[PDB]
Amino acid sequence: VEPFPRRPITRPHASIEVDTSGIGSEKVFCLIGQAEGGEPNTVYELRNYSQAKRLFRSGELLDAIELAWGSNPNYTAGRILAMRIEDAKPASAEIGGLKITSKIYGNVANNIQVGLEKNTLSDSLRLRVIFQDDRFNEVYDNIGNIFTIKYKGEEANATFSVEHDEETQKASRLVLKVGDQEVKSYDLTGGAYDYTNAIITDINQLPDFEAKLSPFGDKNLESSKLDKIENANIKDKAVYVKAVFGDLEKQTAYNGIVSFEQLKTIEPFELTKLKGGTNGEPPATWADKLDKFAHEGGYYIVPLSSKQSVHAEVASFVKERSDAGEPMRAIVGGGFNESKEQLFGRQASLSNPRVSLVANSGTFVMDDGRKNHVPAYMVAVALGGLASGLEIGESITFKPLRVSSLDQIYESIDLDELNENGIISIEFVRNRTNTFFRIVDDVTTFNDKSDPVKAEMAVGEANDFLVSELKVQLEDQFIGTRTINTSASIIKDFIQSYLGRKKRDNEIQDFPAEDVQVIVEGNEARISMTVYPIRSFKKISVSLVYKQQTLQA
Amino acid sequence: VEPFPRRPITRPHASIEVDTSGIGSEKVFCLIGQAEGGEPNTVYELRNYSQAKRLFRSGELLDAIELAWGSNPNYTAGRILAMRIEDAKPASAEIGGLKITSKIYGNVANNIQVGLEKNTLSDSLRLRVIFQDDRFNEVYDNIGNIFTIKYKGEEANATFSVEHDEETQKASRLVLKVGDQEVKSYDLTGGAYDYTNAIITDINQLPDFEAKLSPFGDKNLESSKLDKIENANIKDKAVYVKAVFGDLEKQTAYNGIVSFEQLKTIEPFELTKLKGGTNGEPPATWADKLDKFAHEGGYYIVPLSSKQSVHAEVASFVKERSDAGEPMRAIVGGGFNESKEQLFGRQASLSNPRVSLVANSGTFVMDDGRKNHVPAYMVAVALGGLASGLEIGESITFKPLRVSSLDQIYESIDLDELNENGIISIEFVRNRTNTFFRIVDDVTTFNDKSDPVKAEMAVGEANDFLVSELKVQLEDQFIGTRTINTSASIIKDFIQSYLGRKKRDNEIQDFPAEDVQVIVEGNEARISMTVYPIRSFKKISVSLVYKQQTLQA
Amino acid sequence: VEPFPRRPITRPHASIEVDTSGIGSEKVFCLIGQAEGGEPNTVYELRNYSQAKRLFRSGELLDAIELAWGSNPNYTAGRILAMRIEDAKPASAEIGGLKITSKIYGNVANNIQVGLEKNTLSDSLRLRVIFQDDRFNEVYDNIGNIFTIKYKGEEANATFSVEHDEETQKASRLVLKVGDQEVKSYDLTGGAYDYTNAIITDINQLPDFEAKLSPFGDKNLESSKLDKIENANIKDKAVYVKAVFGDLEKQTAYNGIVSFEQLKTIEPFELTKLKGGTNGEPPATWADKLDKFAHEGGYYIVPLSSKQSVHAEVASFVKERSDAGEPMRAIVGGGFNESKEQLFGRQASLSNPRVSLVANSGTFVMDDGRKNHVPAYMVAVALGGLASGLEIGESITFKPLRVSSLDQIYESIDLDELNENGIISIEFVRNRTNTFFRIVDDVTTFNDKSDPVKAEMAVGEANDFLVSELKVQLEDQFIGTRTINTSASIIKDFIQSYLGRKKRDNEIQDFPAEDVQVIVEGNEARISMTVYPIRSFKKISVSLVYKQQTLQA
């Protein structure tokens, strides 16, 4: 509802009630591991490969992103969230009249260099910054000398000053004087005087003074950050205002990988390397690190680690989030070429419905040209990236893996045992001339097959997405709406429209639209419905029978 | 009925009787606070933001109003009531014979400057006022001198007098006198000579005397306020009738901020400042201000203060007016960032059905780029502005707040505890990809959950509005009128109409119209009915069931 | 209805009545900015480029206007409104017994030169006005000496005089005397001699008199402004009535840049420059300027300032007008080459549906040929001039900009983030043989897709124009009319006509005739209507499935 005009009117008029009501999940994937770049305990959004490669410099995580976006040829590249577990810290140094610190966290940041060798021809400090790892070697100049002022009056001498607040060194005035008497002054507080443009215009208006912006950087710096001048003579010189600090803020805020801070006057200093870059140490538990993905919209998450304690932690994490209204599922892999007994031990230890285990490990072809021999959990990453590429309520059963080879080629009996015990395994298809690798099943670690919801990943996915979407939509729409007689009818219409839309997308098989019984009483709304869940075929029986046909003529 | 004519006529005629029957609610939010303007102890009604700014010059109260009208972007800006706690007084100067007084209340009025001059060409005074804080500067040039008299006769002398009467201390007569006799008298004490224009017209009647209006023109003064003159020669002079008092009242009564009144004799004096401009003491007890309210119709009220004594006094006030047939409610808040244990205390101290406590405090962006970080009761103002924007029997549950940021981000457990202690709380949602702020629930401080009327603001508001309108309309129409034998059916029709009208606007759910009963005996209007109350959803139960379906071909 | 004749007559006749009924939006663009000429706090309509140049001599506001007219080559150059922020004042001087004031406001007025001389060859005064900046130069030679008076008789004495009205010192008479007493006198206050040529002719008609007008310019001064003459001999020479200053006024009242007025005696003076030309300084807040735009007529407005205070002031202003009944929308640009963080912080500061942000800044090939490198808000002007060329309901999405170059050329990921966060951005289309630049979207600062009316400029513009036009027409047509039986049908027919005209102009998609319903009750009229919104294509899904085909012979 949107009545127009918003102000009530009592005299004769016309009124209009504009109404826009009614006219108006991606199943995100997550990764955690290590990298040579990006800040710690900070989650990011990954859309392009170039963006991630610029942020995440290198390591196993970048390979895991490339495998996830490459593990599904026939699907799109889905959005992925990533973060760094290492407690890295940046390089920082004290030089000149400033304190410098780098933004990249890690041992690589030590190679950063900052200097202010002065080019006396331009009377400015030539800021050269270098980062040899990134091939970043750029030269900046024209720091200071923002603009000129010159005096051409008939008096004997003239002088001008910039008066600061002594306790904070904040510029508050610009005073032009002859001797000790002010020709005119421009208080730099509260008004158009806050910027250098007003000073330039007002000074230009006076016939006795000139003010023109220099081609050494059109900064237009604020007037509060100007330098402190103390009765500098103006008659013979076109005196240059500098404001070196404010010029560093303006010209180097978003240039390079360098920040600046004050403990002072800025002076020249030599080009010096930064120190204190540290990769840090791993955390005792990953549960604090996993908390950053609590509310980021992630559904599938895969830790880049083969340790059982990390797997159990993640399992407790995804359980707690699902119980808190953030459903999630996890896929893990046990290192390199583990035997079946190790896999059964891991499955017994976990025994989580919302966790899956990958048995096979193999080699993959990367864009770098490396035939990277990866552990099982990178295959779990590839599988998560395939699942994300799939829509809601789809299964990854008998989908291709696009692998180059596998360390272990399991026989029929071995694959059957792995599937029975509740571990995901991968087979090599030698039946045809065009051999390929594919996934045999997507069973969870919870091995009780009697209950398909828990056992099947697709069913539990469809259930969690349906429930969470229906819960959010009902919470947003109907709570706080009046308990009018038509409320029950509106609720039943909305439910039917939501279930008919889900059936259109094939996220659910079918539902009886007649059995949607809504009951309303006071603040409570009691709703009952039936849904047939979308399932995936996994066994076909053919009772072929042969018969005899008699032909006549 | 009203016959035409009302008085009977006995002769043969036609008599007409005409019946004009059958052919022919607002919600207001109150505010109390401090500001740089406005009278003390005065209930001011506001409709326009410009009106509030002009009256309330600046301060917290104007910001509160702006927040209240800015907290409902969709809904109409309803009338709001404001009041100043400060016992301010206006500036005045006892300079010369004139008691200069200013309209504005406070210390700002002291800046006013008032002075007088005189122009000898037209023999008329001048007056000036300088209030440059409001960009105000006016000069009343050539005060007085409404019209001229000149002589054109043959007598040997030509004078006019304006007689001053000691009994009335005013100008009583204006007479043209020559020698020792009156040429023609114009008695100002009565008749059409109460205005000057009668005198101007009648002077022209004489062959020997004529009159004309002044070139300045529009003064149009009462003859009783003319100045005292005795036989001023007009033989060959166009002497102006000065009339200084009347033109002093006209140029300064509604013009500007400054009024004038004589204490003494009128004389010019130079420019001088005003004195006595006092903001005034903030009284400890707010009951001195709450009691000043009346039958305006206000419902909601927020005090702009964190004090317990203020909140208790407001609670006692609203309860008293409710018991006195003027239902009201309040919303309060406590300073900045109070912990839960303090908020529990405040709710236990209040425990009022007609008071609500706000937990959160935060920041709001205003028109003039003001990132105003505000105490909790300003949020309570914002809530009361939302509530006024919402129509009768609606609630503020799950609605947006449009707040910029919040101090306390409460988790689900914290909100649950706050709701269980009857404290309204505001939440920042992380479930949706696009995050936003919104209100949790409209729970009151009173904590008997079996009573939804008192527990819930919306139900209590709807019940009070229904009862108040019903009782008013019944008292107006039927109750207390002369007794007749056929009033029960008409009362029951009126009641049913009223119920139908309530049901039409969704103020009630339904009503069993067949169960309405009316009994009359003497002057006892016995009514009994039933109503199904309005309610707003707060809990949704979805019982989902999964089943398997078989398909044949 | 227009009756004929307008005066009824009771006698037998024929009366004719005539009704001329049935015989018979612009979306104006607004600008505020800097200029070197024009009055302060004054709005001017501008369609002709010569008018805009003359009004605004030069600055950034003239360049903005020229860009707007030239930002849409394939559209009509329509009306634009413009205001000058600078509080300039004009140059003035007092010399020669005359008050001199210039029509140009600012420092440019100081170059004006004015001087007065006398011509010995005709006994007449001379004037010269020069403004070297416009190369303006004109000489009003032989000022005064309006007409001669000659006498031809043989009497000893022949004199004429010009007398004045005492109360005003204006020329009231022109007396001719021969011997000792008058021959004829030309009364000037009232009669047949209001003009001096009538005096010239009648003097010519007299037997012993002659008179002729000075040919230098068609003076034809009215006789009120003639100089005083007393007993000036006629028989000596054909004496001139000079009246130098009145003739000067009549010659230069509406010509040239300079105006003149009396100081008192007037005498010549040397050719000298003027004084007092000043531009002043801009105010802190531009909101006081916007009041003049309250009832001018316009939809789009763009201030020429990158400061956030101006933007917040305009945002507030357009919100106030929208709540009043005259909605507007504001387009702004984020300074020079600002990074994504600054754009985000500006978007988060505005967060208004009726405000749109522009990110890209670049160069435009001006008509002068200069490679004018300009800030973002000049691009926002260009977009505002394209939106004003666009018809109602259209969108600036994918429309060509005709820009020369851009400072920042973005990646696909950067463009997507700029779109998603409610910032208008531009891409450099490189794949074509004809490379160019196109607008990607017209999304507003308000960043929620739930309401396309608030989130899209075109939809919101169509809704606002529709509501305003319907409100105006309904209020003009049916308020104050009679509540006749066919009132509801007439209203329905007028709405259908109006919606069918909208649908014809493609301002709406469609509407259902059945939903249009008119309810009459008392002094009110409730109307229910439906319209399908017009929309712009912003997403095209295509599905291409190949199939086999078999050919027989």
Coordinates of C-alpha atoms in Angstrom, one line a residue, chain B residues 125-455:
Chain B
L125 CA 9.4 58.5 12.8
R126 CA 11.3 55.4 11.7
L127 CA 11.7 52.0 13.4
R128 CA 14.1 49.2 12.7
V129 CA 14.5 45.6 14.0
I130 CA 17.5 43.3 13.4
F131 CA 17.1 39.6 14.0
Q132 CA 19.8 38.3 11.6
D133 CA 19.7 34.8 13.1
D134 CA 16.5 34.3 11.1
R135 CA 17.9 36.5 8.2
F136 CA 15.4 39.1 9.4
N137 CA 15.9 42.8 9.0
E138 CA 13.1 45.3 8.3
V139 CA 12.8 49.1 8.5
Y140 CA 9.4 50.7 9.2
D141 CA 10.0 54.0 7.5
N142 CA 7.9 57.1 8.0
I143 CA 5.6 55.8 10.8
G144 CA 2.4 57.7 11.3
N145 CA 1.1 60.5 9.2
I146 CA -2.0 58.8 7.8
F147 CA -3.4 61.9 5.9
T148 CA -3.0 65.6 5.4
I149 CA -5.3 68.6 6.0
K150 CA -4.9 71.9 4.1
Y151 CA -6.9 75.1 4.2
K152 CA -8.6 76.8 1.2
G153 CA -11.1 79.1 2.8
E154 CA -11.5 82.9 3.4
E155 CA -11.4 83.0 7.2
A156 CA -8.5 84.7 8.9
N157 CA -7.2 81.6 10.7
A158 CA -7.3 77.8 10.2
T159 CA -6.4 75.4 12.9
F160 CA -7.2 71.8 13.9
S161 CA -7.1 70.1 17.3
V162 CA -7.2 66.5 18.4
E163 CA -8.6 66.5 21.9
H164 CA -7.3 64.1 24.5
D165 CA -9.8 62.9 27.1
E166 CA -8.6 62.3 30.7
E167 CA -11.4 59.8 31.5
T168 CA -10.5 57.5 28.6
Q169 CA -6.9 58.7 28.2
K170 CA -7.4 58.6 24.4
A171 CA -8.2 60.9 21.5
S172 CA -11.9 61.7 21.9
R173 CA -12.6 64.5 19.4
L174 CA -11.0 65.9 16.2
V175 CA -12.4 69.3 15.5
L176 CA -11.5 72.2 13.1
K177 CA -11.4 75.3 15.2
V178 CA -11.1 79.0 14.1
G179 CA -10.8 82.0 16.4
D180 CA -13.0 80.9 19.3
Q181 CA -15.5 78.6 17.6
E182 CA -15.6 75.1 16.0
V183 CA -15.8 75.1 12.2
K184 CA -17.0 71.5 12.2
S185 CA -16.7 68.8 14.8
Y186 CA -15.8 65.1 14.3
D187 CA -16.5 63.2 17.6
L188 CA -14.3 60.2 17.7
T189 CA -16.0 58.7 20.8
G190 CA -18.9 57.4 18.7
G191 CA -20.6 57.2 15.4
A192 CA -18.9 56.5 12.1
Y193 CA -15.9 58.6 13.1
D194 CA -14.4 55.6 14.9
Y195 CA -12.2 55.3 11.8
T196 CA -10.1 57.9 10.1
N197 CA -11.7 57.6 6.7
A198 CA -14.9 59.1 7.9
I199 CA -12.9 62.2 9.1
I200 CA -11.1 62.4 5.7
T201 CA -14.5 62.3 3.8
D202 CA -16.2 64.8 6.1
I203 CA -13.4 67.4 6.0
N204 CA -13.9 67.6 2.2
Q205 CA -17.5 68.7 2.8
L206 CA -16.4 72.1 4.0
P207 CA -15.6 74.7 1.3
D208 CA -12.8 76.0 3.5
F209 CA -11.1 72.7 4.2
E210 CA -10.0 69.7 2.2
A211 CA -8.1 66.5 3.1
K212 CA -6.1 63.8 1.2
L213 CA -4.6 60.5 2.1
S214 CA -0.8 60.3 2.6
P215 CA 1.3 59.1 -0.3
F216 CA 2.3 56.1 1.8
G217 CA -1.3 55.3 2.0
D218 CA -2.5 52.1 3.6
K219 CA -2.5 52.6 7.4
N220 CA -6.3 52.8 8.1
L221 CA -6.1 53.5 11.8
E222 CA -8.7 53.7 14.5
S223 CA -9.6 57.4 15.3
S224 CA -9.4 56.6 19.1
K225 CA -5.6 56.1 18.9
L226 CA -4.7 59.5 17.4
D227 CA -2.1 61.7 19.1
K228 CA -2.8 64.8 21.2
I229 CA -2.8 68.0 19.2
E230 CA -4.2 71.4 20.1
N231 CA -4.8 74.0 17.4
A232 CA -1.9 73.4 15.0
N233 CA -2.1 76.0 12.2
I234 CA -3.0 74.6 8.7
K235 CA -3.6 77.9 7.0
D236 CA -0.9 77.3 4.4
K237 CA 0.5 74.0 5.6
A238 CA -0.3 70.4 4.6
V239 CA 0.1 69.1 8.1
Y240 CA 0.0 65.4 8.5
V241 CA -2.2 63.9 11.3
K242 CA 0.5 62.0 13.0
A243 CA -1.4 59.1 14.6
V244 CA 1.8 57.6 15.9
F245 CA 0.3 55.0 18.2
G246 CA -2.0 53.4 15.6
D247 CA 0.7 53.0 13.0
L248 CA 3.1 51.7 15.6
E249 CA 0.6 48.9 16.4
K250 CA 0.0 48.1 12.7
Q251 CA 3.7 47.9 11.6
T252 CA 4.7 45.8 14.6
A253 CA 1.7 43.7 15.8
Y254 CA 2.1 40.7 13.5
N255 CA 5.3 41.9 11.7
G256 CA 8.5 40.1 12.7
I257 CA 9.4 38.8 16.2
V258 CA 9.2 42.0 18.2
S259 CA 6.0 43.5 19.8
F260 CA 5.7 46.9 21.4
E261 CA 3.7 48.5 24.3
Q262 CA 4.1 51.6 26.3
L263 CA 5.0 51.4 30.0
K264 CA 6.0 57.7 30.1
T265 CA 6.1 59.3 26.6
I266 CA 6.9 58.1 23.1
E267 CA 10.3 59.4 22.0
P268 CA 12.9 58.1 19.5
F269 CA 16.0 56.3 20.9
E270 CA 19.0 54.6 19.4
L271 CA 19.7 50.9 18.8
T272 CA 19.8 48.7 21.8
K273 CA 19.9 45.0 22.7
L274 CA 17.1 43.1 24.4
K275 CA 17.5 41.4 27.8
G276 CA 15.8 38.7 29.9
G277 CA 15.9 35.9 27.3
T278 CA 15.9 32.8 29.5
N279 CA 15.8 29.2 28.4
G280 CA 14.4 28.5 31.9
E281 CA 14.9 25.7 34.4
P282 CA 14.1 22.1 33.5
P283 CA 11.6 21.1 36.2
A284 CA 12.4 17.9 38.1
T285 CA 8.8 16.6 37.8
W286 CA 7.4 16.2 34.3
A287 CA 3.8 16.0 35.8
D288 CA 3.8 19.8 35.5
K289 CA 3.9 19.2 31.7
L290 CA 1.9 16.0 31.4
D291 CA -1.1 17.6 33.2
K292 CA -1.3 20.4 30.6
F293 CA -2.5 17.9 28.1
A294 CA -6.2 17.9 27.3
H295 CA -8.9 16.3 25.1
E296 CA -6.9 16.8 21.9
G297 CA -7.1 13.1 21.1
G298 CA -3.5 12.0 21.5
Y299 CA -2.8 8.3 22.0
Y300 CA 0.9 7.5 21.9
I301 CA 3.6 9.5 23.8
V302 CA 7.3 9.0 24.1
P303 CA 9.3 10.9 26.8
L304 CA 12.7 12.1 25.6
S305 CA 14.7 11.1 28.7
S306 CA 16.2 8.0 30.3
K307 CA 15.1 8.9 33.9
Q308 CA 13.1 6.5 36.0
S309 CA 11.1 9.3 37.6
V310 CA 10.0 10.6 34.2
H311 CA 8.9 7.1 33.0
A312 CA 7.0 6.5 36.3
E313 CA 5.2 9.9 35.9
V314 CA 4.3 9.2 32.3
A315 CA 3.0 5.8 33.3
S316 CA 0.9 7.3 36.1
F317 CA -0.3 10.1 33.7
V318 CA -1.4 7.7 30.9
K319 CA -3.2 5.4 33.4
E320 CA -5.0 8.4 34.9
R321 CA -6.2 9.7 31.5
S322 CA -7.3 6.2 30.5
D323 CA -9.4 5.9 33.6
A324 CA -10.6 9.5 32.7
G325 CA -11.9 8.3 29.3
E326 CA -8.8 9.4 27.3
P327 CA -6.9 6.2 26.5
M328 CA -3.2 6.5 26.0
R329 CA 0.0 4.4 25.9
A330 CA 3.7 5.1 26.0
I331 CA 7.0 3.8 24.7
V332 CA 10.3 4.4 26.6
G333 CA 14.0 3.6 26.3
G334 CA 17.1 3.7 28.5
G335 CA 20.2 5.8 27.5
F336 CA 22.8 3.9 25.4
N337 CA 23.6 0.2 25.3
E338 CA 22.2 -0.9 28.6
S339 CA 22.8 -4.6 29.6
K340 CA 19.9 -7.0 29.9
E341 CA 20.0 -7.0 33.7
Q342 CA 19.3 -3.3 33.7
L343 CA 16.5 -3.7 31.3
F344 CA 14.9 -6.4 33.4
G345 CA 15.1 -3.9 36.3
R346 CA 13.3 -1.1 34.3
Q347 CA 10.6 -3.5 33.2
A348 CA 10.1 -4.7 36.8
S349 CA 9.9 -1.1 38.0
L350 CA 7.3 -0.2 35.5
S351 CA 5.2 -3.4 35.0
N352 CA 2.5 -1.2 33.3
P353 CA 0.0 -2.4 30.7
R354 CA 0.2 0.9 28.9
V355 CA 4.0 1.2 28.7
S356 CA 6.5 -0.5 26.4
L357 CA 10.3 -0.7 26.9
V358 CA 12.8 -0.6 24.0
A359 CA 16.1 -2.5 24.3
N360 CA 18.2 -1.4 21.3
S361 CA 20.0 1.9 20.6
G362 CA 21.5 2.9 17.3
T363 CA 22.3 5.5 14.7
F364 CA 20.1 7.3 12.1
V365 CA 21.0 9.3 9.0
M366 CA 19.1 12.6 8.8
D367 CA 18.5 15.2 6.1
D368 CA 21.6 17.4 6.6
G369 CA 24.1 14.6 6.5
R370 CA 23.9 14.1 10.3
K371 CA 25.0 10.6 11.4
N372 CA 23.2 11.1 14.7
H373 CA 24.1 8.4 17.2
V374 CA 21.1 8.5 19.4
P375 CA 19.9 7.1 22.8
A376 CA 17.4 4.3 23.0
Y377 CA 14.3 6.6 23.5
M378 CA 14.8 8.1 20.1
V379 CA 14.4 4.6 18.7
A380 CA 11.2 4.5 20.8
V381 CA 10.1 7.7 19.0
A382 CA 10.8 5.9 15.7
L383 CA 8.6 3.0 16.9
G384 CA 5.8 5.4 17.9
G385 CA 6.1 7.1 14.5
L386 CA 5.7 3.7 12.9
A387 CA 2.7 2.8 15.0
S388 CA 1.0 6.1 14.2
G389 CA 1.7 5.3 10.5
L390 CA 0.0 2.0 10.9
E391 CA -3.8 1.9 10.9
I392 CA -6.1 0.8 13.7
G393 CA -5.6 -2.8 15.0
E394 CA -2.3 -3.3 13.2
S395 CA 1.0 -4.2 14.9
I396 CA 4.7 -3.3 14.5
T397 CA 5.7 -7.0 14.5
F398 CA 8.2 -8.0 11.8
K399 CA 8.1 -4.5 10.2
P400 CA 11.3 -2.7 9.0
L401 CA 12.8 0.1 11.0
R402 CA 15.0 1.8 8.4
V403 CA 17.8 2.3 11.0
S404 CA 21.3 2.8 9.8
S405 CA 23.2 0.8 12.4
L406 CA 22.6 -0.7 15.9
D407 CA 24.7 -0.7 19.1
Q408 CA 23.5 -4.1 20.6
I409 CA 23.3 -7.0 18.1
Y410 CA 21.2 -9.4 20.1
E411 CA 21.5 -13.2 19.3
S412 CA 18.4 -15.4 19.2
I413 CA 18.8 -16.4 22.8
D414 CA 19.1 -12.8 23.9
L415 CA 16.0 -11.8 21.9
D416 CA 14.2 -14.8 23.5
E417 CA 15.1 -13.6 27.0
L418 CA 14.1 -10.0 26.2
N419 CA 10.8 -11.1 24.8
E420 CA 10.1 -13.3 27.8
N421 CA 10.7 -10.2 30.0
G422 CA 8.2 -8.2 28.0
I423 CA 10.8 -5.9 26.3
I424 CA 10.6 -4.8 22.7
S425 CA 13.8 -5.6 20.8
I426 CA 15.2 -4.9 17.4
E427 CA 17.2 -7.5 15.3
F428 CA 19.7 -7.4 12.5
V429 CA 18.9 -10.3 10.1
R430 CA 21.7 -12.4 8.6
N431 CA 19.5 -15.1 7.1
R432 CA 18.7 -13.2 3.9
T433 CA 21.4 -12.4 1.4
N434 CA 20.4 -8.8 1.5
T435 CA 20.5 -7.9 5.3
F436 CA 18.2 -5.4 6.9
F437 CA 16.8 -4.4 10.3
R438 CA 13.3 -5.1 11.6
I439 CA 11.2 -5.2 14.7
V440 CA 10.7 -8.4 16.7
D441 CA 7.5 -8.0 18.6
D442 CA 5.2 -5.4 20.2
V443 CA 5.2 -6.9 23.7
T444 CA 4.4 -4.6 26.6
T445 CA 6.1 -4.4 30.1
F446 CA 3.0 -6.0 31.7
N447 CA 3.8 -9.7 31.9
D448 CA 0.6 -11.7 32.3
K449 CA 0.6 -13.6 29.0
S450 CA -3.0 -14.9 29.5
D451 CA -4.3 -11.3 28.9
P452 CA -3.5 -10.5 25.2
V453 CA -5.3 -7.1 25.5
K454 CA -2.7 -5.9 28.0
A455 CA 0.2 -8.0 26.8

